[PDB]
């Protein structure tokens, strides 16, 4: 398991705006915001889950990216937890925004390449997953 080993974050991410998380329910999900990639680039993480926590914490520190989160969701991301999506975008017990890889690891997609990571709602991810 490569996602459970240490690695270094790389990549540019993409400029996103206001309702960046609203895009997480459409298309291939939202990209990692450029400012978050700027903060995590060249840092070493112990696992993908360690990277995932840093993403949400960096989100909590970014006034533009976190301003559309309500106070309860802001408390969550400040602890490095994924923010809850709207109920109608959850799937069973999957209630929070997810980080997934665009090109799968088995095909050469890199674990910590921030341009290969997308943010999805559980609902969008299951749709993508079912069409494979």
């Amino acid at each position: 398991s490569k996602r459970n080993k240490p690695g270094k974050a790389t990549g540019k991410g993409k400029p996103v705006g206001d309702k960046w998380l609203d895009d997480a329910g459409k298309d291939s999900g939202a990209p990692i915001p450029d400012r978050i990639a700027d903060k995590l680039r060249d840092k070493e993480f112990k696992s993908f889950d360690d990277f995932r926590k840093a993403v949400w914490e960096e989100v909590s520190k970014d006034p533009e990216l976190s301003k559309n989160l309500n106070p309860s969701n802001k408390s969550s991301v400040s602890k490095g937890y994924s923010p809850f999506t709207p109920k109608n975008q959850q799937v069973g017990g999957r209630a929070v925004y997810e980080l997934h890889h665009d090109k799968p690891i088995s095909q050469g997609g890199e674990v910590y390449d921030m341009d290969n990571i997308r943010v999805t709602t559980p609902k969008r991810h299951i749709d993508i997953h079912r069409g494979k």
């Binding site: 408390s75 969550s76 400040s78 490095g80 109920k87 209630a95 929070v96």
Partner: protein
């Protein structure tokens, strides 16, 4: 524990405040408490009561307790166990 009538309003306020402040040691634990909250309230909006309040709804802990209390009252469902106030004096 088993249904919302097992909570006094104060215990339910402590539960909601726990959730709102993300007073847990893991995301797993917070997600479990949110699910438990949904199961207690029986509200069709589930976690949206906490994270995606309806425009003009009070999303403070006390706000959310109130919204639950009132929605249950209006839909003919059971409410909170009465609390037993501690009195320091006769």
């Amino acid at each position: 524990k088993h249904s919302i009538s097992d909570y006094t309003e104060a215990e339910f306020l402590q539960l909601v405040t726990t959730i709102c402040n993300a007073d847990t040691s893991s995301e797993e634990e917070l997600v479990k408490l949110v699910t438990h909250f949904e199961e207690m309230t029986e509200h069709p909006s589930g976690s949206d009561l906490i994270y995606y309040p309806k425009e003009g709804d009070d999303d403070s802990p006390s706000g959310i307790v109130n919204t639950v209390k009132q929605w249950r009252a209006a839909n003919g469902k059971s409410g909170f166990k009465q609390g037993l106030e501690h009195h320091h004096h006769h």
